[PDB]
Design a protein around this nucleic acid. Structure first.
Ligand code: MG
Lengths: 145, 242, 94, 136, 96, 52, 249
RNA sequence: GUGAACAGCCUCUAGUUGAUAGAAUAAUGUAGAUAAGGGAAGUCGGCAAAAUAGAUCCGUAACUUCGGGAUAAGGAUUGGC
RNA sequence: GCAGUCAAGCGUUCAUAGCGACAUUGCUUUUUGAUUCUUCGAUGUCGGCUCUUCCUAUCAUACCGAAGCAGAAUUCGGUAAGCGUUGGAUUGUUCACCCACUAAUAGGGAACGUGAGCUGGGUUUAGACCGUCGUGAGACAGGUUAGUUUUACCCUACUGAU
């Protein structure tokens, strides 16, 4: 009776005041957070063509996926690839501080070497890296000839 | 006749492969297990840190002799490329596709005669005889199904697990053309193929393997230079007790 | 008879004309015995590992221990991919 | 991890909770296994201790030999059928759940294992890797 | 009574109050200290986040069980155009 | 096991900062300060074009 | 178990064995009640102090009786070292005095909980608790002379050497100051004193060596004198059953 | 019309378009749903929900007052031209 | 607790009046780990789901001390409540005991926490059957079935928002 998505017992008879720590209902999200120890993999350059090409792939392509990022344009600028998940959403502004102290663990010392960068389209099930792949694999169409 | 322990496991044939002209070792952690092979083998044969399908158990996935090396299907292209870079041209290295992946449990062999699982297909049985340059026989040790886990071979002699009947030993030695003893390794483990590795001039086994058990292994593979294996009658006094 | 299972060795019955002998490469017979306490002995890359870091920290180059016709390309990188259809399917002799 | 398990066990998805009937893969003489508890589990209010691929769980035989039945004994999971994650880029899942029965040392009981054993289990238990006819 | 069954608290009391922040650009609360022999070095930089993508990598991690093996994982890509200086502010230390 | 703020580990971690892991940062703060000096020289060359 | 005896935890003197149990029930069980409380809360308060303390002496005494080797039906030799060294009469009396004391604590606990349910106030329930802990204290004060003995036998039975009578041994016997300590020093890795006087060793020292891929254990005697062949020291009597029972060279 | 049918669903003759409305889609609700792996471990208790269902053919136990039990259980099949 | 052996202390000036601590010695169903499956009757109503806090009399982790402690494994004690303390079976039951994991499954308070938060399982009306008692109406808190769960929009507290 009266709900199931809630807290059942919210207090006791003494003290006769709802405590500051009993999980009430309210705002979720749009807070400011600090998440530390994120590791930069790649510092690309906007004037540099073939950003997405590693030492392995040898395919001239930029990290901008097919039809671009979803809800965002194209990376034709300098970019920082960092692992994990920065708090915040797309088309928002982040601020990148540097480390606040000398980091001790061996994980903060390793030199990475990226072997393949994905650039398939994020607006659906991306199955091709470049549009040259898709027109190669599909064959030709009615609207081409 | 060397005792060696992978990280804290007495199992060696799981974690290493040893033939007459090469050796294969896992990559886990640190180079203590790799050093013990350089203590015995020296620089005379290549010893290879390798992984098979991104694993550490490389002695039960592969199978081979001094002529050839067989890897299963799940061996990636980089790891197949890595084996040929280290090993010389005298070895043949070929990826084999089957139903069953683990070739170590299924193929036990010396440089000359191989034994296979019964359910193996004849389109691989042709390939085994062609790559490894050996004969192939379809047989089971004591009605146990995996001939690679429960038997260990070299050109010198052969060792089987103690459930083998005496009638089964006399039949099976005509196929392998080597002497056969029922034995245990690492204090009574039935799995005698996984416990140890052996070639014609070296045997490497676990630390748990007791001194009566080294006496059997040093005998049947004739590890000292003046051993005709007939000293097992002199070593029968250890055998009656143990 | 169960201890006799661990005593009775088997005999081959010799079942061919074809002779089968063990193979030892002559560098093994030429090889000296390793000695634990000695001013001069080979390094045994445990000790290569020891002088630059301990056990878990030491980075083994898996390369620089294999055979090629030229040492100068021992550290090169396999491309492993072009646009489609990865490179390991195409390369061959001739 | 615990005793007998060589190396560390990475994170894979929790597929088998308490009270899960799974097939008995080996030739020991049992048909199916009933999970009652998972060794190396956590402690949290109202959670069920969930097994995964390659864990030693206590399992009673429901159908099989009467010698094996009515006594609790350890068992190692070899097939999962819940989608888990390999660290190379694929998610895979087997067809059914399966387990082989063992001593607390981590040694096998039977001689053979039918069907494919998981790759995550085959690195973890060497005695399972000795009896594994088919890996992956 | 005495709760009969212990359980950890729900929520983290460090992040109180949960409320909407003052602006869509969060201010930085603290900076790296000062290494006063080094050359002049800007402590931070600000850019625009844009999506996510996957990266495979040959993991060069000694000691792990994934040493010398390939690892797929997810990264973020933050669009980071160059940033131009327009002002200088100095701060005097007070006992306030 | 020992907690994060124990006196034993924080004495142990302070020695590693005296050793290897500060050398990599002091190598890092020299390479980045080199490129920031070449940030002015590229942007002064474009100012020379308008002087023409 | 066989072949060694080290897994016996401890045994405390009776003044301290009482102080362990009673201070434990002051710390574990609650202590704060009022006369204004409802009387079933008062009764179940004092029932638990008799019950938990009653279990408290038993769990101590259950650990003693299981841990001692049960000198009857072990082995004819391992019974017989303890016969000469530990005096089987005084061994079996004191371990029986604990088992009698274990039943009486269960007796007082199962009787006074039955009486404490008929209490009618705080005061009558307070008297039945103090009489219950007092009568449990009386049994333990009576148990002083066993527990003082059993601590001093717990030490040397931990320091007995491991011999297996079924495995292959060989005895070394003779007079005092012959050289049978010096023989044992060079034949194996063992710390046996080689001092030139009569009775250097006072226990059966054991050394282990190998011949033809086997384990041989070599056992030394303190050296013996026949003088009556009837009555003898506790030291020299250790040899004879080490001669009689062990089937070897 | 579909169908065993005055079932349910849609339509013809006839009748009504009345029941305060407009804009947005937070929490919690009332009403109605779907869910990976495990299948009652939930709980006073399988409460609830899921499962089965129409039809032709094969097949049906203990027991029984010989009438029943019985649609027992269980198993094959269904469109179009 | 009683029956004793004492005497460190006391009795207005004092041994032997009169007590009399720590001690000490004895039984209340078996000095030889054999037994001994003895769970010998609580007469006012709480239990659990959810969810916070607090006490330390500390089960686990931290650093220590002593041992009649080789190592390992334990036993006893100190500072210490920062952090954790579970999954199931029978019962309306708390309690109780078993199976199993685990580093450990520590003890208690907050109207014996907690009903405009729930549940209605139990307790506490009317219906009804059985057993005993009563000539009879009926009694029994002996046993067993079936039984209406109402309100927040107000002030304040608290989570959010101008
Ligand atoms: Mg002497």
């Amino acid at each position: 009776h009266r709900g199931l998505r809630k807290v059942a017992c919210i207090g006791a008879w003494h003290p006769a005041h709802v405590m500051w720590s009993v999980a009430r209902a309210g705002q979720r999200g749009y807070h400011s957070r600090t998440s530390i120890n994120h590791k930069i993999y790649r510092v690309g350059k906007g004037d540099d063509e073939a950003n997405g090409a590693t030492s392995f792939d040898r395919t001239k392509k930029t990290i901008t996926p097919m039809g671009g990022f979803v809800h965002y344009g194209e990376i034709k600028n300098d970019f920082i690839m960092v692992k994990g998940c920065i708090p915040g959403n797309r088309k928002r502004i982040v601020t990148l501080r540097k480390s606040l102290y000398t980091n001790t663990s061996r994980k903060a010392l390793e030199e990475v070497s990226l072997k393949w960068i994905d650039t398939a389209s994020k607006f659906g099930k991306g199955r091709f890296q470049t549009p040259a792949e898709k027109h190669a694999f599909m064959g030709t169409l009615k609207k081409d000839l | 006749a060397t005792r060696t322990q992978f990280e804290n496991s007495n199992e060696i044939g799981v974690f290493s492969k040893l033939t007459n002209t090469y050796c294969l070792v896992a990559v886990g952690g640190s180079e203590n297990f790799y050093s013990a092979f350089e203590a015995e083998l020296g620089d005379a044969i290549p010893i290879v840190h390798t992984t098979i399908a991104g694993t550490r158990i490389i002695g039960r996935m592969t199978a081979g002799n001094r002529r050839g090396l067989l890897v299963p299907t799940q061996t990636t292209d980089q790891e197949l490329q890595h084996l040929r870079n280290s090993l010389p041209d005298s070895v043949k290295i070929q990826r084999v596709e089957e139903r069953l992946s683990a070739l170590g449990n299924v193929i036990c062999c010396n440089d000359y005669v191989a034994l296979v699982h019964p359910d193996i297909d004849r389109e691989t049985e042709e390939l085994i005889s062609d790559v490894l340059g050996v004969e192939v026989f379809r047989q089971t040790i004591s009605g146990n199904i995996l001939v690679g886990s429960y038997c260990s071979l070299s050109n010198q002699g052969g060792l089987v697990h103690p459930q083998t009947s005496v009638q089964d030993q006399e039949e099976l030695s005509s196929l392998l053309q080597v002497p056969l003893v029922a034995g245990t390794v690492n204090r009574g483990s039935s799995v005698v193929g996984a416990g140890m590795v052996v070639n014609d001039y070296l045997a490497v086994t676990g630390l748990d393997t007791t001194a009566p058990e080294l006496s059997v292994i040093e005998s049947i593979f004739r590890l000292q230079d003046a051993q005709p294996e007939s000293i097992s009658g002199n070593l029968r006094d250890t055998l009656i007790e143990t | 008879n169960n201890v006799l299972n661990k005593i009775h060795v088997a005999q081959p019955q010799a079942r061919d004309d074809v002779k089968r002998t063990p193979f030892i490469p002559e560098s093994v017979k030429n090889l000296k015995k390793y000695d634990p306490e000695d001013p001069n002995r080979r390094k045994l890359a445990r000790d290569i590992e020891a002088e630059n870091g301990g056990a878990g920290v030491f980075n083994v180059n898996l390369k620089d221990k294999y055979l090629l016709e030229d040492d100068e390309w021992k550290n090169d990188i396999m491309p492993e991919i072009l646009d489609g259809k990865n490179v390991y399917d195409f390369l061959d002799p001739e | 991890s615990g005793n007998g398990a060589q190396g560390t066990k990475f994170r894979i998805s929790l597929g088998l909770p308490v009270g899960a009937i799974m097939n008995c893969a080996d030739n020991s003489g049992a048909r199916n296994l009933y999970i009652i508890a998972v060794k190396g589990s956590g402690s949290r209010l109202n959670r069920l201790p969930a097994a995964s691929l390659g864990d030693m769980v206590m399992a009673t035989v429901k159908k099989g030999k009467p010698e094996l039945r009515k006594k609790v004994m350890p068992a190692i999971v070899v097939r999962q059928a819940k989608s888990w994650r390999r660290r190379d880029g694929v998610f895979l899942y087997f067809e059914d759940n399966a387990g082989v029965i063992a001593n607390p040392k981590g040694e096998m009981k039977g001689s053979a294992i039918t069907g494919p054993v998981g790759k995550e289990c085959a690195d973890l238990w060497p005695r399972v890797a000795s009896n594994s006819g088919v890996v992956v | 009574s005495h709760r009969k069954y212990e359980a950890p608290r729900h929520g983290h009391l460090g992040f109180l109050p949960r409320k909407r922040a003052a602006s869509i650009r969060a201010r930085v609360k603290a900076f790296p200290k000062d290494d006063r022999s080094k050359p002049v070095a800007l402590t931070s930089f600000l850019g625009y986040k844009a999506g996510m993508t996957t990266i495979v990598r040959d993991l060069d991690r000694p000691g792990s069980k994934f040493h010398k093996r390939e690892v797929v994982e997810a990264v973020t890509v933050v669009d980071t155009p160059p940033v131009v200086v327009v002002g200088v502010v100095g701060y005097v230390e007070t006992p306030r | 096991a020992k907690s994060l703020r124990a006196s034993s580990h924080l004495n142990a971690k302070s020695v590693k900062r005296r050793g290897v892991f500060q050398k990599a940062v002091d190598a890092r703060e020299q390479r980045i300060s080199d490129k920031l000096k070449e940030d002015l020289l590229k942007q002064k060359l474009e100012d020379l074009k308008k002087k023409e | 178990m066989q072949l060694s005896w080290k897994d016996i935890p401890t045994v405390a003197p009776a003044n301290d064995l009482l102080d362990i149990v009673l201070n434990r029930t002051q710390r574990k069980t609650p202590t704060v009640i009022r006369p204004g409380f409802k009387i079933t809360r008062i009764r179940a308060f004092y029932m638990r102090k008799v019950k938990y303390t009653g279990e408290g002496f038993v769990e101590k005494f259950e650990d003693i009786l299981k841990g001692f080797p049960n000198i009857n039906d072990v082995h004819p030799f391992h019974r017989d070292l303890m016969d000469t060294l530990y005096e089987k009469n005084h061994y079996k009396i004191s371990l029986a005095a604990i088992s009698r004391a274990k039943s009486l604590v269960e007796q007082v606990a199962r009787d006074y909980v039955r009486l404490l349910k008929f209490g009618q106030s705080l005061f009558q329930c307070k008297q039945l608790k103090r009489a219950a802990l007092g009568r449990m204290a009386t049994i333990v004060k009576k148990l002083r002379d066993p527990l003082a003995y059993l601590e001093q036998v717990r030490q040397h039975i931990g320091r007995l050497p491991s011999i297996d009578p079924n495995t292959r041994t060989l005895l070394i016997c003779g007079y005092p100051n012959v050289g049978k300590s010096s023989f044992l020093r060079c034949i194996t890795k063992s710390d046996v004193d080689v001092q030139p006087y009569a009775f250097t060793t006072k226990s059966l020292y054991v050394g282990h060596f190998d011949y033809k891929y086997l384990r041989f254990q070599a056992i030394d005697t303190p050296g013996i004198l026949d003088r009556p062949t009837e009555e003898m020291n506790n030291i020299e009597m250790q040899s004879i059953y080490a001669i009689a029972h062990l089937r070897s060279c």
